[PDB]
Amino acid sequence: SMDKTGWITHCFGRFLIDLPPDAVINAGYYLWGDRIEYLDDKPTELAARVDRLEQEWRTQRHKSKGNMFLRKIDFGNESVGLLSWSSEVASKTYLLDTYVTSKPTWHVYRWKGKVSVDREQHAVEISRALARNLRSRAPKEIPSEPGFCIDHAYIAGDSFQVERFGVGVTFPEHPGARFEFRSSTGAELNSLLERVDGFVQNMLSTFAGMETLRKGKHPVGSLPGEEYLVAGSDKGQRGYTFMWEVQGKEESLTEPNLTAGLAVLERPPPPAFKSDKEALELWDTIVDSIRVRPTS
């Protein structure tokens, strides 16, 4: 824990975070509500996918006597899009399946979502730009440029954009334990304590076998993070439920809603930790490493 030797600093969206080298990491990234998704397709494979999927939309009935395919849009920068009706019933909505590529190193990402007839051109203009802003980042590179980092790449820019990610992390040394780190634009209406506190006291006072290890402020650098940590024993198993949270500012990339959490279930398998001490060391070491990525 406190001995951050061999620990690896990672990139997720606008932020950085240190983690032990043993950690098993799995991340999800979302843009304008819709998931941006990495594909391990070499250029020929993607061409096959798009061709295969285009013909599928054509051999699929829309309403009575028309197919579901509409357009194959070219966003340039080696990227493409497929416009289709939102479903078998027209409504007034499409499905814009975007396939953006990274530069200079080749990767392709699928970014798909529904859009109305009256906003299709706008959505295209977004994909048009996402295509020329999506740049690749080297395996261990920590980009100095402004941008939202994703899998094997980042979306360059400091212009506002709703963005969100969620990283699930497990540790082999500490089995049963699960850490999660999430970011999301938009501000929550209450702080952590203002929201959850009342109910936690009503559960702790009601049910036995638990104690509030910590509570209150836990600022990390310029980030105003409150925290709540609960622990308890049952089944001869020691359970944990931690959380840290910056409630974030509206229309802000650098101070969005930002949450770190760690939990260990009960219900004897091997201990996730030796004691409460070891658990809070890991928790504090990781949370204190949270920070906005320095950007020129």
Author numbering: 32 to 298, 305 to 333
What is written in the article reporting this PDB entry?
P. aeruginosa encodes three distinct T6SS hemolysin coregulated protein (Hcp) secretion islands (named H1-to H3-T6SS) that act against both prokaryotic and eukaryotic cells. TplE, a novel H2-T6SS-dependent lipase effector, was recently identified. TplE is an antibacterial lipolytic toxin and TplEi interacts with TplE to provide protection from TplE.
Next, we also obtained crystals of TplEi alone and determined the structure at 3.06 Å resolution using SAD.
